[PDB]
Design a protein around this ligand. Structure first.
Ligand SMILES: COc1ccc2c(c1CN1CCNCC1)O/C(=C\c1c[nH]c3ccccc13)C2=O
Length: 270
């Protein structure tokens, strides 16, 4: 109809995501089908329409520019919703990027981690909590060296009280969720960011089983600088209140002198 459907990009119990092209102007898009009976949490537009929470969250952040994917349009069907999302081209998610390249140089990890921090800060400033930050949910604009957060289907409105639901990725979930099924938004996000940063500089996640998450002992399987190890272990503090704020992360000595996105593309991507 309005969009030329291309190949399937991924699928799950939630639904299916296709590559697409907007017919009117040949704009690259992603077409995300969301099964109604599998929606974790429902949202509501100001006009009262019940929609998947991802629609609400994306609209709250889909303003101006940021490192968050833009929701271009959305439709409702009898049994599903259809989301039209921005699609960079060429693109590769961070999972495939690390799989092909192995552990990233710290200069490159610094650039990527900084951009993720800026994107997560933007979400929180807009009252949005992603709840599934991980390499698979980060797209790399290979030409511009810019990263973009994707998939808010596990997200929620940001609040200052405790969350008791979680449908994100378990190996990125904090020990307080594993033990008590309870967490606060910001400190749980910082934990996932610690997992992500370890993943970038070591080429794999640090914990596989619940017992390792609860123990919280970080072993580095790759050569990693002392400053980077410190930031990782700080983000992965067992006590949530011991974890750094976003400001403390970006003011950490390891985060100084970040490359610009285009510089990052020139040195590491082209
Ligand atoms: C199971 O696979 C999923 C699940 C959820 C989403 C999704 C995908 C497809 N891949 C899977 C592997 N990692 C990257 C995403 O894509 C999304 C949004 C996208 C927005 N614009 C894009 C452009 C290019 C590819 C993707 C998207 C999602 O929410």
């Amino acid at each position: 109809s309005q969009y030329q459907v291309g190949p399937l990009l991924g699928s799950g119990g939630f639904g299916s995501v296709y590559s697409g092209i907007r017919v009117s102007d040949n704009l690259p898009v992603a077409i995300k089908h969301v099964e109604k009976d599998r929606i974790s949490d429902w949202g509501e537009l100001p006009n009262g329409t019940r929609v998947p929470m991802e629609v609400v969250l994306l609209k709250k952040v889909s303003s101006g520019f940021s490192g968050v994917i833009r929701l271009l349009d959305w439709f409702e069907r009898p049994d599903s919703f259809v989301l039209i999302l921005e699609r960079p081209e060429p693109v590769q998610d961070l999972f495939d990027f690390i799989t092909e390249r192995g552990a990233l140089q710290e200069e490159l990890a610094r650039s990527f981690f900084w951009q993720v921090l800026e994107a997560v800060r933007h979400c929180h400033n807009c009252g949005v909590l992603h709840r599934d930050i991980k390499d698979e949910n980060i797209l790399i604009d290979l030409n511009r060296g810019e990263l973009k957060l994707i998939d808010f289907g596990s997200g929620a409105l940001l609040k200052d009280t405790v969350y008791t639901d979680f449908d994100g990725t378990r190996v990125y979930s904090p020990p307080e969720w594993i033990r008590y099924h309870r967490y606060h938004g910001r400190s749980a996000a910082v934990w996932s960011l610690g997992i992500l940063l370890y993943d970038m500089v070591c080429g794999d996640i640090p914990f596989e089983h619940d017992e390792e998450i609860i123990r919280g002992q970080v072993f580095f399987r790759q050569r990693v600088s002392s400053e980077c190890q410190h930031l990782i272990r700080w983000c992965l503090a067992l006590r949530p209140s011991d974890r750094p704020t976003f400001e403390e992360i970006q003011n950490h000595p390891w985060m100084q002198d970040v490359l610009l996105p285009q510089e990052t593309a020139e040195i590491h991507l082209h």
